[PDB]
């Protein structure tokens, strides 16, 4: 149930990040998509940040707390389950050899990270329902892009950790009818 | 109003405690005292004002009921049971007298101060509640002058109650607070509404406290920048002392 | 049902001071035990010198280590349910009983009683990555009994 | 807010002598845990000889380590809170209570006070890549206290 | 936001480290590039040193500091985190089997890393704002160039710590209302 | 400079008797640990009855374990000290008193003053390959003093 509603609360925050870097340290326009593109759609010369879903680890046995609608009289169990997701956050940004004010893709990576780790950015992702575990490196790889150039292509893992609810349903009982047997 | 950083006294004769009970219940705490009708040579208020200025407030062994106290040179201003307890239902510390065996002793009887609805009621408490807010001010006005500023957002939490803290360390050895206690149905309920969580009232149960800052946005008169402010908030555990023995000696 | 999962479990604490009609843990640790007990002694033997084997029933009480996933409703009872029973300066502690029963989904119910806190953290320990470490809580329980099967 | 992260922690530290109104430390150790506490003892129980268990309160104070990044802001003060509080030849120590206060990312804070440094390493020590080695800190505190939920 | 100034003090560096290899030992001219060249560019015969960025490890929790800017009273929290980023350093020298004072493209790399790790130009690098740290393997390896010869072309990983700064604002506090609530 | 490397490292020894105006060490391990200190004590602390903690600031000497490389200048000078302070039949020690200066690239400089050799190994072992195994020493200082930032 909470696969769209962190994707937008993602590129809400990834959006800020990039707002906030093109403070400090400037580039001309930016871009924030999801890497597997559901439709055919190229990569944007402008710098971007690319982000994609990689694996999903539940974290704990599932904890169920039992809500009494009043209505019905069903007790309306809720199963909260504990998930790591793990996003893949990496970005593009082609190196113009003649400019003088270079900031390679390395730096747009490097600025996404330190701002998701820092403390202000932490308290406010805690407001919006989830959070953020620490990154523990960022690989800038080397490739050729579509004009036979070379490219770096850096990209972390992100874990953020939040809480999914399933509701179901089970019957109540206000009774008590015992058999007390003699040995 | 005020309500905090102070007790006051009213010096008041005999035969307007009526009235000035009327007038003058509730209102937070206010020390009434009935005054010798026949001569001033006791300054009557100043009973309050000395054992406050003698408490210290830093050494283990603090409170002091306020009741059975001692003074001297002072002039008995009731001395009859039905009197005493006219007096009596009206606040007013009559500095009575009894007899023992022998001898006369002196007392200070009661130390209710007027309160009646939430308040301290008492002096003892009320004493340790203006202490207590004399002492966190204090450090939070140090913690200021110190480094300027907390920042708040769970950081300035930590500056705030790290330096509140060892002002509670004094109070719980102190005297002040109360290691027991047994919040029951109504103070549960109140402990659990005012801001604590539902297990809150178990570490009043237990501990003889719960303090937690938040932090509140507010606007001044004419600061047009939304300034931000510190919010603690510490329930204090009160603390009982006996008055009154009742004994049933059988079989003679 | 003979079968070897326990996924389904569910622990039932009832302190007579503490929690009277107390709470359920279903939110267990993933890397850790979620149930544990030390292996009971129930018995010792000594050799003679002809070789008499000699026996002794040696009373013995049992124990159970319980791990939570930290900071959780559940963990939270059991962290109040500790504080109370520890003992420490200016605090006074409760001396309750303690019951927990086990319902693991095969049917079958573990039922303990007559026990009492016996370790804990206190303190929501930080792994390195910066989850939170699971917390474990022991008991010691005097009287064992299972019921149902199937 | 049950969830289980604690990236976005801190600790408050006061000592009473050396640092009144003190320092914040937020640069905890990547690879050993940033704060981490030994089992609670809180109670000890005996088995008597028809299976009566006695079970005994005992008073225990808390431990707390954590784990810095060595040579910084945070990890110079707290060498310097040690330094003070130890005891060496013609050196004078203070002994002082320090309050440490954690106030973790989901909202709860703990605070632990009465305490005193139980350790330390005191020298930078080198790894073999040339890495400097996180530096640990032991606290022994006597009262516990935890304060805020999400 | 570093990766560019750090560029340009490994690009003096190993410059200058060309300049002392060409003292001890000597070689036809020489050439310090990166080696993901952003436009399509040769390789040059003359005796070069080749760097790429291969990783960035952040080393610890970010350390958050507060600083008032007594303005607008505003806490700009500064999160400095600790990196370590890592340089693949290689060499490039073809062998002419004619000329007598032979060296090798292993002389140059293992000059370039003796340099490095030498006292005097780590205190230097320190006064440059970043240090360095062991290098454990230097791997001379062989291959074919684009004349049908064999060629080695040995690389090392260099280890280079310092630190990021991000810059971002949080609000200020002078008070401090109580509610001493009893019981 | 706030950085966690410490390459350039430097161990200026002193010795009253077997070196005055002593020697330099910088051809530390690669594979152990180059500079190495077991952790402080500084304090011990136990608990009264009703919960009353109690500290003691019990004295201590502080420790430290430089690992060298084989066969080097700056380790013959360290097995020299070492063999010198030793005791053994029909020869002489020299009790001298030792002062270690671990000067760290950063900046900030630890010295360590009226101490002693405590351990070494004596006979170069060999490893399994034909390698010889780094040799550790151990020394125990009475007066560590921190000098110098960034």
Same mark, same amino acid.
């Given at each position: 149930?909470?696969?769209?509603?962190?994707?937008?609360?993602?590129?809400?925050?990834?959006?800020?990040?990039?707002?906030?870097?093109?403070?400090?340290?400037?580039?001309?326009?930016?871009?924030?998509?999801?890497?597997?593109?559901?439709?055919?759609?190229?990569?944007?010369?402008?710098?971007?940040?690319?982000?994609?879903?990689?694996?999903?680890?539940?974290?704990?046995?599932?904890?169920?707390?039992?809500?009494?609608?009043?209505?019905?009289?069903?007790?309306?169990?809720?199963?909260?389950?504990?998930?790591?997701?793990?996003?893949?956050?990496?970005?593009?940004?082609?190196?113009?050899?003649?400019?003088?004010?270079?900031?390679?893709?390395?730096?747009?990576?490097?600025?996404?990270?330190?701002?998701?780790?820092?403390?202000?950015?932490?308290?406010?992702?805690?407001?919006?329902?989830?959070?953020?575990?620490?990154?523990?490196?960022?690989?800038?790889?080397?490739?050729?892009?579509?004009?036979?150039?070379?490219?770096?292509?850096?990209?972390?893992?992100?874990?953020?950790?939040?809480?999914?609810?399933?509701?179901?349903?089970?019957?109540?009982?206000?009774?008590?009818?015992?058999?007390?047997?003699?040995? | 109003?005020?309500?905090?950083?102070?007790?006051?006294?009213?010096?008041?004769?005999?035969?307007?405690?009526?009235?000035?009970?009327?007038?003058?219940?509730?209102?937070?705490?206010?020390?009434?005292?009935?005054?010798?009708?026949?001569?001033?040579?006791?300054?009557?208020?100043?009973?309050?004002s000395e054992i406050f200025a003698a408490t210290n407030y830093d050494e283990?062994?603090?409170?002091?009921?306020?009741?059975?106290?001692?003074?001297?040179?002072?002039?008995?201003?009731?001395?009859?049971?039905?009197?005493?307890?006219?007096?009596?239902? @009206?606040?007013?510390?009559?500095?009575?007298? !009894? +007899?023992?065996? /022998?001898?006369?002793? *002196?007392?200070? &009887?009661?130390g209710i101060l007027c309160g009646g609805p939430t308040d301290a009621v008492?002096?003892?408490?009320?004493?340790?509640?203006?202490?207590?807010?004399?002492?966190?001010?204090?450090?939070?006005?140090?913690?200021?002058?110190?480094?300027?500023?907390?920042?708040?957002?769970?950081?300035?939490?930590?500056?705030?109650?790290?330096?509140?803290?060892?002002?509670?360390?004094?109070?719980?050895?102190?005297?002040?607070?109360?290691?027991?206690?047994?919040? @029951?149905?109504?103070?549960?309920?109140?402990? !659990? +509404?005012?801001? /604590?969580?539902?297990? *809150?009232?178990? &570490?009043?149960?237990?501990?003889?406290?719960?303090?937690?800052?938040?932090?509140?946005?507010?606007?001044?008169?004419?600061?047009?920048?939304?300034?931000?402010?510190?919010?603690?908030?510490?329930?204090?555990?009160?603390?009982?002392?006996?008055?009154?023995?009742?004994?049933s000696d059988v079989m003679i | 049902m003979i079968n070897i999962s326990a996924?389904?479990?569910?622990?039932?604490?009832?302190?007579?001071?503490?929690?009277?009609?107390?709470?359920?843990?279903?939110?267990?640790?993933?890397?850790?035990?979620?149930?544990?007990?030390?292996?009971?002694?129930?018995?010792?033997?000594?050799?003679?010198?002809?070789?008499?084997?000699?026996?002794?029933?040696?009373?013995?009480?049992?124990?159970?280590?319980?791990?939570?996933?930290?900071?959780?409703?559940?963990?939270?009872?059991?962290?109040?349910?500790?504080?109370?029973?520890?003992?420490?300066?200016?605090?006074?502690?409760?001396?309750?009983?303690?019951?927990?029963?086990?319902?693991?989904?095969?049917?079958?119910?573990?039922?303990?009683?007559?026990?009492?806190?016996?370790?804990?953290?206190?303190?929501?320990?930080?792994?390195?990555?910066?989850?939170?470490?699971?917390?474990?809580?022991?008991?010691?329980?005097?009287?064992?009994?299972?019921?149902?099967?199937?």
């Amino acid at each position: 149930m909470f696969d769209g509603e962190l994707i937008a609360k993602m590129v809400v925050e990834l959006n800020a990040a990039m707002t906030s870097a093109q403070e400090a340290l400037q580039f001309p326009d930016f871009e924030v998509v999801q890497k597997a593109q559901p439709t055919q759609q190229g990569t944007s010369t402008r710098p971007t940040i690319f982000f994609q879903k990689l694996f999903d680890i539940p974290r704990g046995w599932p904890a169920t707390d039992w809500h009494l609608d009043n209505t019905t009289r069903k007790y309306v169990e809720i199963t909260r389950q504990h998930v790591e997701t793990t996003f893949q956050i990496s970005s593009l940004h082609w190196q113009n050899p003649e400019i003088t004010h270079v900031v390679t893709a390395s730096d747009i990576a490097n600025y996404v990270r330190a701002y998701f780790q820092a403390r202000s950015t932490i308290e406010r992702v805690k407001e919006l329902d989830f959070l953020i575990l620490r990154v523990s490196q960022i690989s800038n790889e080397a490739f050729e892009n579509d004009n036979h150039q070379f490219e770096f292509h850096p990209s972390f893992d992100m874990v953020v950790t939040y809480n999914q609810y399933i509701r179901l349903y089970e019957n109540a009982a206000y009774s008590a009818d015992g058999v007390l047997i003699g040995v | 109003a005020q309500n905090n950083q102070f007790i006051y006294t009213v010096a008041t004769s005999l035969a307007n405690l009526g009235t000035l009970f009327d007038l003058v219940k509730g209102n937070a705490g206010t020390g009434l005292h009935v005054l010798s009708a026949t001569a001033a040579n006791d300054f009557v208020e100043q009973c309050p004002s000395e054992i406050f200025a003698a408490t210290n407030y830093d050494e283990p062994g603090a409170s002091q009921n306020y009741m059975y106290y001692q003074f001297p040179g002072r002039n008995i201003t009731v001395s009859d049971d039905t009197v005493a307890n006219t007096v009596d239902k @009206s606040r007013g510390n009559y500095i009575g007298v !009894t +007899q023992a065996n /022998g001898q006369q002793l *002196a007392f200070y &009887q009661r130390g209710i101060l007027c309160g009646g609805p939430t308040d301290a009621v008492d002096m003892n408490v009320y004493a340790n509640e203006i202490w207590l807010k004399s002492a966190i001010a204090q450090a939070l006005l140090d913690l200021f002058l110190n480094v300027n500023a907390v920042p708040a957002s769970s950081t300035g939490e930590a500056m705030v109650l790290a330096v509140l803290q060892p002002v509670l360390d004094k109070a719980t050895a102190n005297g002040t607070f109360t290691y027991g206690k047994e919040i @029951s149905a109504v103070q549960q309920q109140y402990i !659990t +509404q005012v801001t /604590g969580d539902r297990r *809150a009232w178990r &570490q009043v149960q237990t501990l003889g406290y719960w303090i937690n800052i938040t932090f509140s946005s507010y606007t001044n008169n004419n600061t047009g920048l939304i300034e931000w402010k510190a919010n603690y908030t510490l329930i204090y555990s009160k603390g009982d002392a006996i008055r009154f023995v009742e004994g049933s000696d059988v079989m003679i | 049902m003979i079968n070897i999962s326990a996924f389904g479990s569910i622990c039932q604490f009832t302190a007579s001071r503490t929690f009277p009609n107390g709470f359920t843990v279903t939110e267990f640790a993933d890397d850790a035990d979620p149930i544990d007990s030390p292996p009971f002694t129930a018995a010792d033997t000594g050799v003679g010198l002809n070789g008499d084997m000699v026996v002794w029933n040696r009373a013995n009480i049992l124990e159970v280590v319980v791990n939570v996933i930290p900071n959780t409703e559940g963990e939270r009872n059991l962290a109040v349910l500790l504080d109370a029973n520890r003992t420490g300066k200016d605090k006074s502690g409760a001396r309750d009983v303690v019951g927990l029963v086990v319902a693991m989904p095969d049917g079958s119910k573990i039922t303990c009683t007559n026990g009492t806190p016996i370790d804990g953290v206190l303190i929501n320990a930080v792994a390195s990555v910066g989850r939170l470490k699971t917390k474990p809580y022991r008991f010691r329980f005097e009287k064992v009994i299972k019921a149902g099967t199937s």
